[PDB]
DNA sequence: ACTAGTAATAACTACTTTATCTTTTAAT
DNA sequence: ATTAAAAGATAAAGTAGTTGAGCCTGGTCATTACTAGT
């Protein structure tokens, strides 16, 4: 529903990996993982350029 | 809200008249003037709470996305009502809830 | 197909105006060039560059 | 009287630059 | 004594560089109207 601020409505996975994940928790976990992958990908190039500049 | 003209349909402007020292609404497109009885002309507030009521319409009662509660209505004491928050997108908007009944379809806060 | 048809219409317009200014009669069959449409579609699909 | 060669048809951060400004000074 | 001239401070805007290492695979590399051989 609209204006829901409960934890389960905003990305709280109360179940464990052994118990499984509900579809909403699965989608939220996928969103978090995608954000982490994007952050790592954008971080590697900047780190490499900084390292090359320092070496030079 | 500034009054508009009558023959060219243009909004009027405050002006001072000296022989009677009166404020009057005047038009520059034509020669139409009228008396102004309100010194209140300019308003600019830094912080406001106007607009929290939102655009509530009589058709808001059948919206399925709005959550439903059982709060006490002031006048009809209905057990069926919906609630939401303020429409204002201000950064410092409070989280006070707005309740709308279904039998009378009018708003009431917690105050 | 819209772009290729525009190009074909331009080419056939050039051909008919050349035929008129040379004072000759066209057979209406040698003016049309299917090769431009065929080659454009084939090249666009084969290479992936969506253009001429 | 026809044919084939054939040649021409991207944001982020930085520096630099320019014109604007204006205050300054000696001149009205 | 006071203000025209103007040299110069500098505020504002236009311009320009540059982006992590390697490795593998496959695909492409124009086009057609003018003028000379038989
Ligand atoms: Zn008027
Ligand atoms: Zn009610």
Q: Can you describe what's shown?
A:
The structure is cut from a larger assembly and holds chains A (56 residues), B (111 residues) and C (52 residues). Helices cover 59% and strands 0% of the residues of chain A. Chain A is mainly alpha-helical and 56 residues long. Chain B folds into two domains: 44 residues, N-terminal domain of TfIIb; 67 residues, N-terminal domain of TfIIb (Single Sheet), CATH 2.20.25.10. The two termini of chain B are 31 Å apart. In chain B, 0% of the residues lie in helices and 23% in strands. Chains A and B meet through loops of A and loops of B. The complex binds zinc ion (2 copies). One zinc ion (ZN) binds next to loops of chain B. The site of one zinc ion has 6 residues of chain B, from loops. The structure holds a DNA duplex (28 and 38 nucleotides).
| Helix-residue proportion of chain A | 55-70%
Structural class of chain A: mainly alpha
Question: CA-to-CA gap between the ends of chain A?
Answer: 56 Å
Backbone CA Rg of chain C: 13 Å
> Total strand count of chain A, please?
0
Strand fraction of chain A equals under 5%
Radius of gyration of chain A, in angstroms, nearest whole number: 18 Å
Biggest sheet of chain C, in brief? none
Fraction in helix of chain C: 55-70%
- The oligomeric state of the chains shown is part of a larger assembly
Order of helices and strands of chain C: HH
Task: Report the strand count of chain C.
Answer: 0
- The helix/strand class of chain C is mainly alpha
Q: Greatest interface and its residue counts?
A: A-B, 4 and 6 residues
Number of helices of chain C: 2
- Enumerate how many helices of chain A there are, as a single number: 1
Query: How many strands, what sense, and barrel or not for the largest sheet of chain A?
Result: none
Distance between the termini of chain C: 12 Å
Strand content of chain C: under 5%
Coarse morphology of chain A:
elongated
Subcellular location (chain B): Nucleus, Nucleolus
Family (chain B): Belongs to the archaeal rpoM/eukaryotic RPA12/RPB9/RPC11 RNA polymerase family.
GO molecular function, one term (chain B): nucleic acid binding
Subunit structure (chain B): Component of the RNA polymerase II (Pol II) complex consisting of 12 subunits.
